[PDB]
Each structure stands twice: as C-alpha cells, then as structure tokens.
Design a binder for this molecule. Structure first.
Ligand code: MG
Ligand code: MG
Ligand code: MG
Ligand code: MG
Ligand code: MG
Ligand code: MG
Ligand code: MG
Ligand code: MG
Ligand code: MG
Length: 135
C-alpha cells in the first residue's frame, strides 16, 4: 500500500516513488536511546546506497510517546545526519501497516513495494546490508 509523507526537509515522499528499488525503512522515536545511537549507521547505509536500494526513516509524532510534530521538528535540529530522510507520520498509520511494536524496527520492502521482513531492535550495519542483498 502506498503512503505519502513529508520529511523534516519539507520534501514529500511516496513509497511508489521507489518502485523498482528495494527499500530499507527504519522506524524510530526521539526518546529511544538505542535508536539515536544507531542513526550514524543508518546515515552511512543511506550515503552508500548508490542505485542499489533506498533508505527512509519514519517518526510518528503523537504516537508511542513521541513529541508533537512541531516539537519534533525543533528537537531534530539538534541532530546531524546529512543523508537521512526523516518522514513524519502524525497519523500513526504506518506503525499499524508495518506491525511495529517497539523501536527501532527495521523494515525491508521489495522492488514492488511489498513488505518482505521486519526486525524489532538493533541490527548491525553489515546485517542490514546483507538483508538487502538477499531481496
Ligand atoms: Mg513537498
Ligand atoms: Mg524525546
Ligand atoms: Mg532523546
Ligand atoms: Mg541511555
Ligand atoms: Mg515511527
Ligand atoms: Mg512514535
Ligand atoms: Mg507516553
Ligand atoms: Mg502531533
Ligand atoms: Mg532539520
């Protein structure tokens, strides 16, 4: 199922934009210390993507204890990730769609936009990359 979300960067992202490419989607929240500790890995994976896959991240203001959208966008200015899209979903709908129960959750989507795998929790960078290769 398609989604359309705006990033903290003001860009509008649609899942269908990436038809033909594999997608790694990271679900996270500002309060999640493991999430924050791993964002540098996520940013590297995004930087290194080339034409192989696409990286997106998603926060959900007002859900699972996340800040409001306005407060989140301010807070995020304190962070420094030049290569990471941070899509904002104040509806909480993607959490439901992807069956996200905890943070972080790693989601892997195939070239047709169908969900192949989710993984709750920390995942090492090379394991994420290998998972993408196996799609
Ligand atoms: Mg836009
Ligand atoms: Mg917080
Ligand atoms: Mg925090
Ligand atoms: Mg701590
Ligand atoms: Mg989220
Ligand atoms: Mg949340
Ligand atoms: Mg709460
Ligand atoms: Mg909100
Ligand atoms: Mg910003």
């Amino acid at each position: 199922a398609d989604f359309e979300l705006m990033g903290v960067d003001g860009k509008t992202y649609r899942l269908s934009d990436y038809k033909g490419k594999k997608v790694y989607l990271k679900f996270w929240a500002s309060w999640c210390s493991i999430c924050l500790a791993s964002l540098p890995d996520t940013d590297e994976i995004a930087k290194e993507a080339g034409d192989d896959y696409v990286v997106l991240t998603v926060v959900s203001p007002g859900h699972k204890g996340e800040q409001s959208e306005a407060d989140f966008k301010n807070w995020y200015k304190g962070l420094d990730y030049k290569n990471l899209p941070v899509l904002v979903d104040p509806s909480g709908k993607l959490l439901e769609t992807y069956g996200v129960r905890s943070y972080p959750t790693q989601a892997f989507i195939d070239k047709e936009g169908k969900l192949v795998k989710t993984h709750p929790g920390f995942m090492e960078k090379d394991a994420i990359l290998q998972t993408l290769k196996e799609l």
